[PDB]
Amino acid sequence: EEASFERGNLDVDKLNGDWFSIVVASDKREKIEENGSMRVFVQHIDVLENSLGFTFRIKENGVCTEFSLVADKTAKDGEYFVEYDGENTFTILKTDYDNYVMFHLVNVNNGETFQLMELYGRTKDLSSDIKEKFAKLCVAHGITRDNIIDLTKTDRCLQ
């Protein structure tokens, strides 16, 4: 059931559809707090020929906007590239397709770099079990718990 990038058993077509941003984590906290550019709430993922298209909402100064990005599959294993507040490279850490997906993303901008990890669900919320598994991976990638943010407890622009 656990389809990683490290197995290469990743049927990317089954990621298609509606998703919700559940937890977000970054070793550069500023970016996922209010008005952070990575405090984005996913709505949809569109699987294309060698790219993934994401629809996000974001809240800048009290207003939700919706925007879309298309990420291109790069030559490297499981990696994707997309341009957004810098250059972003990301991979799918782990997913079971019809409940959760975890992403690992690195952003380069002005010579600075940070890590971002996201937990998406097919429902507005996920169980504790999955949130805690996600937290373990964050810690394994050197993002400590004070830089993990459960979004299910905040405005995610659902309304």
Side-chain angles (χ1 to χ4, degrees):
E1 209 187 339
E2 321 104 289
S4 201
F5 69 104
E6 294 176 2
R7 279 184 206 74
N9 68 324
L10 178 63
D11 187 346
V12 80
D13 273 345
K14 300 189 210 208
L15 295 170
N16 226 95
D18 289 336
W19 291 96
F20 299 82
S21 285
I22 311 298
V23 187
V24 66
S26 174
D27 61 13
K28 186 144 140 57
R29 202 179 202 284
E30 179 208 330
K31 294 292 190 164
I32 61 168
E33 289 173 336
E34 301 251 343
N35 303 328
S37 56
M38 303 295 177
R39 184 184 263 253
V40 287
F41 317 104
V42 71
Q43 311 303 291
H44 202 265
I45 286 172
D46 277 287
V47 184
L48 313 152
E49 279 252 292
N50 286 314
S51 49
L52 302 178
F54 296 82
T55 297
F56 288 112
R57 291 171 181 171
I58 185 164
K59 188 175 163 186
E60 280 182 335
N61 308 114
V63 183
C64 298
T65 299
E66 205 177 69
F67 69 95
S68 283
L69 301 174
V70 182
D72 297 307
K73 178 89 179 74
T74 69
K76 297 169 172 179
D77 176 37
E79 277 192 12
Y80 287 90
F81 174 81
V82 73
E83 194 153 59
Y84 173 73
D85 194 32
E87 295 190 331
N88 306 280
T89 297
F90 73 84
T91 70
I92 296 161
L93 285 180
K94 185 171 264 290
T95 178
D96 69 355
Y97 300 118
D98 49 58
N99 286 283
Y100 74 84
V101 59
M102 305 178 179
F103 289 96
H104 180 265
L105 178 153
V106 176
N107 172 266
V108 174
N109 180 334
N110 288 323
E112 287 197 39
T113 289
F114 66 89
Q115 284 178 111
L116 178 83
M117 288 182 50
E118 308 183 76
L119 174 67
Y120 298 165
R122 314 228 65 160
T123 40
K124 302 164 166 161
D125 211 342
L126 298 173
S127 72
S128 306
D129 185 60
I130 299 171
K131 291 183 193 185
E132 173 54 28
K133 290 182 184 182
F134 176 68
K136 290 206 186 188
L137 293 172
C138 295
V139 176
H141 292 68
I143 308 164
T144 59
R145 289 169 164 285
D146 47 308
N147 296 321
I148 306 180
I149 301 183
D150 185 326
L151 300 172
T152 63
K153 316 267 172 147
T154 74
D155 176 21
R156 292 179 281 173
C157 300
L158 310 165
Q159 297 178 316

